[PDB]
Write an enzyme that holds these catalytic residues in place. Structure first.
Site, short mmCIF file in Angstrom:
data_model
loop_
_atom_site.label_atom_id
_atom_site.label_comp_id
_atom_site.label_asym_id
_atom_site.label_seq_id
_atom_site.Cartn_x
_atom_site.Cartn_y
_atom_site.Cartn_z
N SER A 179 14.29 -8.35 18.40
CA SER A 179 13.77 -8.10 19.96
C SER A 179 13.26 -6.63 20.20
O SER A 179 13.55 -5.77 19.33
CB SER A 179 14.79 -8.65 20.89
OG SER A 179 15.65 -7.66 21.16
N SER A 204 0.91 -1.16 0.16
CA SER A 204 0.07 -0.16 0.12
C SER A 204 0.82 1.28 0.06
O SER A 204 1.27 1.64 1.02
CB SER A 204 -0.83 0.09 1.07
OG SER A 204 -1.79 -1.31 1.16
N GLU A 264 10.94 -14.29 28.47
CA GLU A 264 10.33 -13.23 29.00
C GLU A 264 9.01 -13.53 29.74
O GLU A 264 8.96 -12.91 30.86
CB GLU A 264 9.87 -12.35 27.85
CG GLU A 264 9.37 -11.21 27.83
CD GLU A 264 8.90 -10.26 26.66
OE1 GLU A 264 9.87 -9.92 25.95
OE2 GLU A 264 7.75 -10.09 26.61
N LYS A 293 15.03 -16.42 19.24
CA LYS A 293 14.29 -15.58 19.43
C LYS A 293 12.91 -15.92 20.14
O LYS A 293 12.24 -15.58 20.99
CB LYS A 293 13.98 -14.73 18.05
CG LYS A 293 12.65 -13.71 18.07
CD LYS A 293 12.81 -12.71 18.68
CE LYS A 293 11.68 -11.56 18.57
NZ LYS A 293 10.20 -12.22 18.72
N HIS A 345 13.97 -16.88 23.61
CA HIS A 345 13.72 -15.53 24.35
C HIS A 345 12.48 -15.03 24.65
O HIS A 345 12.22 -14.52 25.86
CB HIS A 345 14.68 -14.54 23.30
CG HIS A 345 14.11 -13.16 23.52
ND1 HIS A 345 14.76 -12.23 24.31
CD2 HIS A 345 13.01 -12.72 22.50
CE1 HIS A 345 14.10 -11.07 24.07
NE2 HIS A 345 12.87 -11.36 23.11
N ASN A 346 11.70 -15.37 23.77
CA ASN A 346 9.93 -14.90 23.81
C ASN A 346 9.45 -15.75 25.23
O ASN A 346 8.85 -15.21 25.94
CB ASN A 346 9.25 -14.82 22.59
CG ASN A 346 9.58 -13.47 22.17
OD1 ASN A 346 8.58 -12.59 22.35
ND2 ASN A 346 10.39 -13.43 21.28
N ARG A 365 3.49 -49.53 32.18
CA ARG A 365 3.51 -49.60 30.79
C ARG A 365 3.83 -50.84 30.17
O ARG A 365 3.16 -51.32 29.30
CB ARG A 365 4.32 -48.46 30.21
CG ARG A 365 4.01 -47.12 30.30
CD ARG A 365 4.93 -45.91 29.52
NE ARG A 365 4.92 -46.15 28.17
CZ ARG A 365 5.95 -46.60 27.52
NH1 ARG A 365 6.96 -47.17 28.12
NH2 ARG A 365 6.27 -46.78 26.19
N1 LIG Z 1 1.72 -4.70 17.36
C1 LIG Z 1 2.01 -5.19 16.06
O1 LIG Z 1 1.32 -5.41 15.21
C2 LIG Z 1 3.70 -5.82 16.11
C3 LIG Z 1 4.14 -5.96 17.23
C4 LIG Z 1 5.03 -7.13 17.00
C5 LIG Z 1 5.77 -7.18 15.67
N2 LIG Z 1 5.08 -6.74 14.75
C6 LIG Z 1 5.77 -6.65 13.18
O2 LIG Z 1 4.84 -6.11 12.18
C7 LIG Z 1 4.92 -7.18 10.99
C8 LIG Z 1 3.40 -7.77 11.42
O3 LIG Z 1 2.33 -6.78 10.88
P1 LIG Z 1 0.98 -7.31 11.38
O4 LIG Z 1 0.35 -8.37 10.73
O5 LIG Z 1 0.94 -7.14 12.83
O6 LIG Z 1 0.10 -5.94 10.68
P2 LIG Z 1 -0.90 -5.68 9.17
O7 LIG Z 1 -1.14 -4.19 9.51
O8 LIG Z 1 -1.83 -6.78 9.10
O9 LIG Z 1 0.16 -5.98 8.13
C9 LIG Z 1 1.61 -5.18 8.72
C10 LIG Z 1 2.18 -5.30 7.28
O10 LIG Z 1 2.17 -6.27 6.38
C11 LIG Z 1 2.05 -5.86 5.12
N3 LIG Z 1 1.08 -6.93 4.23
C12 LIG Z 1 0.18 -7.83 4.78
N4 LIG Z 1 -0.23 -8.71 3.82
C13 LIG Z 1 0.78 -8.61 2.87
C14 LIG Z 1 0.91 -9.19 1.52
N5 LIG Z 1 0.19 -10.19 1.02
N6 LIG Z 1 2.05 -8.67 0.77
C15 LIG Z 1 2.77 -7.63 1.26
N7 LIG Z 1 2.66 -6.85 2.18
C16 LIG Z 1 1.63 -7.40 3.27
C17 LIG Z 1 0.93 -4.69 5.37
O11 LIG Z 1 1.12 -3.93 3.98
P3 LIG Z 1 0.01 -2.88 3.88
O12 LIG Z 1 0.08 -1.76 4.58
O13 LIG Z 1 0.02 -2.88 2.35
O14 LIG Z 1 -1.21 -3.59 4.22
C18 LIG Z 1 1.70 -4.03 6.48
O15 LIG Z 1 2.74 -3.10 6.14
C19 LIG Z 1 5.77 -8.13 11.26
O16 LIG Z 1 7.11 -7.36 10.83
C20 LIG Z 1 6.05 -8.09 12.96
O17 LIG Z 1 7.33 -8.57 13.33
C21 LIG Z 1 4.07 -6.03 14.82
#
Ligand SMILES: NC(=O)c1ccc[n+]([C@@H]2O[C@H](COP(=O)([O-])OP(=O)(O)OC[C@H]3O[C@@H](n4cnc5c(N)ncnc54)[C@H](OP(=O)(O)O)[C@@H]3O)[C@@H](O)[C@H]2O)c1
Ligand SMILES: NC(=O)c1ccc[n+]([C@@H]2O[C@H](COP(=O)([O-])OP(=O)(O)OC[C@H]3O[C@@H](n4cnc5c(N)ncnc54)[C@H](OP(=O)(O)O)[C@@H]3O)[C@@H](O)[C@H]2O)c1
Ligand SMILES: [Mg+2]
Ligand SMILES: [Mg+2]
Ligand SMILES: [Mg+2]
Ligand SMILES: [Mg+2]
Ligand SMILES: [Mg+2]
Ligand SMILES: [Mg+2]
Lengths: 479, 479
Positions: free
Chosen positions: B128, B34, B189, B182, B185-186, B449
């Site tokens: 992390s 996007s 925590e 990792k 590690h989780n 057993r």
């Molecule tokens: N609080 C949190 O959400 C949180 C905390 C821990 C880790 N993370 C990190 O954030 C990421 C997870 O994101 P999310 O799933 O939580 O959020 P999300 O809003 O569902 O999507 C996160 C990202 O993934 C992209 N994405 C989803 N499906 C895709 C596809 N088929 N092709 C290309 N891009 C795609 C989205 O792009 P668009 O903008 O185009 O949708 C956005 O940039 C991982 O790298 C994770 O380690 C997030």
């Protein structure tokens, strides 16, 4: 000239199952990929009833009365998918493929989708009791379409273990529900064996009793509410003398639990479903630790014990202690089952199965290692309240906990003061004291996570999510 | 005019990571499926450094200096595989795809096989510290081909947390090693947060301290051996007053952690590897139980407590009890880490990774929630003995256990007598007392057993497997 049921896979389990069907007056089609196993079954067990042997899948399927009922008893995984495909290819619309193997319930879900699509019916059937149950009367846990049981049920009721006239089989639910309840049954078995192990450990190393005396205590306990197959065979094992050495057999056995076993699947499913199976979980972790041969060797005599005491120095009467151990064993058994039935409700809800827990406690009374008259109290609990939130809250069990809880605390204190491990007894009491608690430290965990990660919390007095501005003025905002 | 590193996925975690790269002097290619998120990063933060924004995967890849380094920060699972394939199709031989998302290590293993076979390099990097660590300095745990670290390492060192001049990043091992450590590690925590919660629960409900007083205790502990980020932030949380009610903030938070996290993956891996992670397991189970809202509401005031006492009636000095709880916390933290490091060893052996645990204890000192000077004692333990069987047997830690053990037994006894839950404190002591045991009840389980299933056992006094003929003459045979 047609069979009402067939078995594919004539290793000991499938052969024993075919014999059971045949002894109970069914005509049974049998097939094995290697024909020599089929020839051996006919040659050595053909007098047990009416068998129709076939050399090919096509001949096997042709020998079954429509709607055709074929149970698969082969190696779990790829080998069972191979046979499902061979039967699928040969069968007509409305025919019924049954996997009686110890399937992962997620495998059964995927198979029921693929096979229901092909115009066939798929049944995942958990079969308890191992080889002896397959031959002489198992508990059977079929999951699949409800109309599959109209034609399959009377056959399964003909071989199932019978308890007071009640066959140990009923339709569990759709798709994977049968393999699911079988998997939870397997984990419960681990907890039942571990709580017996802990009672044994305290009677031996706190009360100073040798195995032959502990056998006699278990036989006395087995006359009361704990009455169970597992306690009965425990006394026989503790009574056994090694002919070579004159020592108790248990004392010459390598104390490392067979790292082959499926109790781990139960705990993995509970972790996924958000259920605290502390009792099955600690029972699995205890088997794992027992097998850490080099770590145990390196630890022996090298970790500080601290100041330990003994029953004599504490002024504890041996008879009162033995009874307190019995009550800790019962309380811990009850926690492990409450958790296991929580896992069954969570799995049923997640998968839309409408599992009736009364059916499980009913059919686990025969042909199962866990069989015990305790199970009747589970039937009755759910009969009284289909939406009971925990077995611990059943009026009968809650009244029993009133008499167990003082003993249970005394056992945790005493085992601790003597340096004796009691993982399921201790973990069951922390879980119990956690359900009792008005407020748990999860509130602190929510605060810690809001501090480090702005993960937000809920409030007791307002709906929604909130955040404290930790890095700033520490005011609260809506999230 | 080319970027040295790129980020795909500009939700907060990837946008933060790109900002980190850019603030530290790197030219950073940025792309998001996007475009509006790419526009937003450039508008809001383009002043922070040199970004090259692209609208398409092909423009993004063309903006990167060879060998191309692209870090994927998108939704875990199929979305990550979708982006990997789009990059792989656009890249040249020798290019490097890095997944920085919270991947399942078995997915990383599969991806590294597929992508390596195409003449590319695949790195799974655990990152992390959440959103704050991505912006301000994370711990980074890359797994993949060692040669990849030569072009990637210096970029990762430019943004990593730095402790006493050591960057919190090093090459962990091949394929899935990075996402695996990792994941552990989780889990750790979870255990660190649970043992703090149990200490809090005892100081509040046994020692009768209010949150503001408990905050002062944690600050004093934080001056000693327990010195940790988690204990620091715990005192800030416990000091916090809710403006609206005047109550401690913790008292108006809903005490439900629920299931919003991946600590469960650590336990599932432990179960598959045969490692008894009782600490991490009980921590995960405690979070699950806290979230059982309807069950807890039904259980409140309905389960019998038994006869309880209090520190006054026991004659326990409050200051002595507070120090005993500190020492129970330390002992139980040490058990949970010992078990997590056993899980790291077991995973590394199963996957031939040759993970050096010194690397993990070094890089978790920065940008990780679990950061503590305690981690240096782990580095030193393995420095002294690369094949150390348990952290519990390290000379420093074993010496510490000599001073903790009497306190630890008192805390389990006292919590039990007061009806307070302590699942990690009590399970950690049963585990400890299980490593101390000469003989475990696993011998009785082997006998059971063999009785019910002829599963056979090993003997302490000669080689091979044996079976007792339980249904027959109860003689022993070789199997
Ligand atoms: N609080 C949190 O959400 C949180 C905390 C821990 C880790 N993370 C990190 O954030 C990421 C997870 O994101 P999310 O799933 O939580 O959020 P999300 O809003 O569902 O999507 C996160 C990202 O993934 C992209 N994405 C989803 N499906 C895709 C596809 N088929 N092709 C290309 N891009 C795609 C989205 O792009 P668009 O903008 O185009 O949708 C956005 O940039 C991982 O790298 C994770 O380690 C997030
Ligand atoms: N004994 C126990 O402790 C216990 C307890 C419960 C259940 N089980 C039973 O154990 C069995 C697991 O099998 P195993 O691997 O351990 O023994 P196995 O002897 O290797 O295999 C058992 C059966 O699988 C058949 N089979 C394997 N691959 C096949 C394929 N691709 N196509 C067709 N048939 C195939 C074999 O046919 P062939 O004769 O042609 O090789 C044989 O009849 C299940 O039937 C299960 O119900 C074990
Ligand atoms: Mg005859
Ligand atoms: Mg019968
Ligand atoms: Mg009674
Ligand atoms: Mg229901
Ligand atoms: Mg920095
Ligand atoms: Mg010190």
């Amino acid at each position: 000239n047609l069979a009402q049921i067939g078995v594919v896979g004539l290793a000991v389990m499938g052969s024993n199952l075919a014999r059971n069907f045949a002894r109970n007056g069914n005509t049974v089609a049998v097939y094995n990929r290697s024909t020599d196993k089929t020839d051996k079954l006919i040659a050595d067990h053909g007098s047990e009833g009416n068998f129709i042997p076939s050399a090919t899948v096509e001949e096997f399927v042709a020998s079954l009365e429509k709607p055709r009922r074929a149970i698969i008893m082969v190696q779990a995984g790829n080998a069972t998918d191979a046979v499902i495909n061979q039967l699928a290819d040969a069968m007509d619309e409305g025919d019924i493929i049954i996997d009686g193997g110890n399937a992962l319930y997620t495998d059964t879900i995927r198979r029921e989708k693929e096979i229901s699509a092909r115009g066939l019916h798929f049944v995942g059937a958990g079969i308890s009791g191992g080889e002896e149950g397959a031959l002489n009367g198992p508990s059977i846990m079929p999951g699949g379409p409800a109309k599959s049981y109209e034609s399959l049920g009377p056959l399964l009721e003909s071989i199932a273990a019978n308890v007071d006239g009640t066959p140990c089989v009923t339709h569990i639910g759709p798709d994977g529900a049968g393999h699911f309840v079988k998997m939870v049954h397997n984990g419960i078995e681990y907890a039942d064996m571990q709580v017996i192990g802990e009672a044994y450990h305290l009677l031996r190393y706190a009360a100073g009793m040798q195995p032959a005396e502990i056998a006699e205590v278990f036989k006395e306990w087995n006359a009361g509410d704990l009455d169970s197959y597992l306690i009965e065979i425990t006394a026989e094992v503790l009574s056994q003398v090694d002919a070579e050495t004159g020592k108790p057999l248990i004392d010459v056995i390598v104390d490392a639990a067979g790292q082959k076993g499926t109790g781990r699947w139960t705990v993995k499913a509970a972790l996924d479903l958000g259920i605290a199976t502390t009792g099955i979980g600690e029972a699995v972790f205890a088997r794992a630790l027992s097998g850490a041969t080099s770590q145990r060797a390196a630890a022996q005599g090298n970790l500080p014990a601290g100041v330990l005491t003994d029953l004599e120095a504490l002024g504890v009467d041996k008879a009162q202690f033995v009874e307190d151990v019995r009550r800790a064993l019962y309380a811990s058994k009850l926690v492990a089952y409450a958790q296991g039935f929580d896992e069954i409700k969570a799995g049923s809800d997640e998968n839309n199965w409408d599992v009736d827990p009364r059916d499980l406690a009913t059919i686990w009374r025969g042909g199962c290692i866990i069989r015990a008259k305790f199970l009747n109290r589970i039937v009755e609990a759910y009969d009284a309240n289909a939406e009971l939130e925990s077995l611990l809250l059943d009026p009968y069990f809650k009244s029993e906990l009133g008499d167990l809880i003082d003993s249970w605390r005394r056992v945790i204190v005493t085992a601790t003061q003597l340096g004796l491990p009691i993982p399921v007894f201790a973990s069951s009491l922390s879980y119990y004291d956690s359900l009792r608690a008005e407020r748990l430290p999860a509130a602190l965990i929510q605060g810690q996570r809001d501090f480090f990660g702005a993960h937000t919390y809920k409030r007791i007095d307002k709906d929604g999510s909130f955040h404290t501005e930790w890095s700033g003025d520490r005011s609260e905002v809506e999230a």
